[PDB]
Amino acid sequence: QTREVLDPIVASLMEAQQIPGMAIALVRPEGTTISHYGAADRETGTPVDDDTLFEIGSLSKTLTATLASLAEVEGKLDFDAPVSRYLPELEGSAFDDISGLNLGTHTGGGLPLFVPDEVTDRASLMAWYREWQPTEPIGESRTYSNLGIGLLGLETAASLDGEFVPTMRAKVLAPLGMQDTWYDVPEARMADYAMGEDKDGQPTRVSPGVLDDEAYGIKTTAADLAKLVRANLHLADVDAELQQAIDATRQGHYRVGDMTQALIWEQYSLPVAPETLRAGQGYDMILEPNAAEALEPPQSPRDDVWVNKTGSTQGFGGYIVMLPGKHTGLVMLANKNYPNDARVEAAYRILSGLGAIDVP
Length: 360
Ligand SMILES: [Ca+2]
Ligand SMILES: [Ca+2]
Ligand SMILES: [Ca+2]
Ligand SMILES: [Ca+2]
Ligand SMILES: [Cs+]
Hints:
By secondary structure, the chain is α+β, with helices and mostly antiparallel strands. It is built from twelve helices and 15 strands. Helix 1 (2-17) packs antiparallel against helix 12, helix 2 (61-73) packs parallel to helix 5 (146-159) and helix 2 crosses helix 9. It is classed as hydrolase.
């Protein structure tokens, strides 16, 4: 069925990229199919199964965006308000001029990609933010940023008067049934935690760091991520306010060349050429500032787009695609950090093989 389309493509991908193991969820009206392939740990040979936890890296940012949006729906967070309204410890800094929306769209004045080495804890982070000078025009330039989405997580937690992880668990993960999603893998689930494999074929596992939870720290299953995808596709039964929060994450906020930046989610109008998708995952988009043009008609979520997000760690590579117009979504998790171009190709081939897209 689905599996006759999916299986050969996955086999071929895993051989070409030497990926030890994958977990794949396909979400459609009719239901969700979960598929597991290969080994959770190349060394031990333990097979990937329903309980296997993968590092999803920057896919975590989709949850951060979702909680931020829920705080907004509840009236606790104003997305266009200055960040310093909610983190008064930043009053007088550039965060008087940068909003939560800027942070969720990577338009926060050139805020850099990585947490600097000199930042080692919350106190040193906040002092770094206080001193930092914007290098790009706020709201007019996109620079993909862990610091930015991390600060949105801090802003959101403050607006909700809660700690980020337990608040995420209670307000987003639990209501979505995401019970195999972890920021810190419990000791009792360590046997289920896949071992990563880096580009050099060496075992690797992510280390804690500043803003890890907010930016890149989730370990989860494909099935759990599929619940988030299901809700984004209007295929879940969830709380009205949570559904509203989720839908708002797909509002288009900035045009960035061919790409539309929503709240973390990135999207393209259909039909889309794979080369366009590849360009979205390349050096020029990810590692340079790109001019960004605000959409203040904030675009209502669209039904004729390819919505996506990549995420990686040193040892893992994930990709989510949604096609809201076809009520179809795809989650691909691997315990190898394999090239984004191959993620794009595999996803396109799967979705086209399933009839959810046309090629030429
Ligand atoms: Ca406002
Ligand atoms: Ca560093
Ligand atoms: Ca942390
Ligand atoms: Ca090819
Ligand atoms: Cs959990």
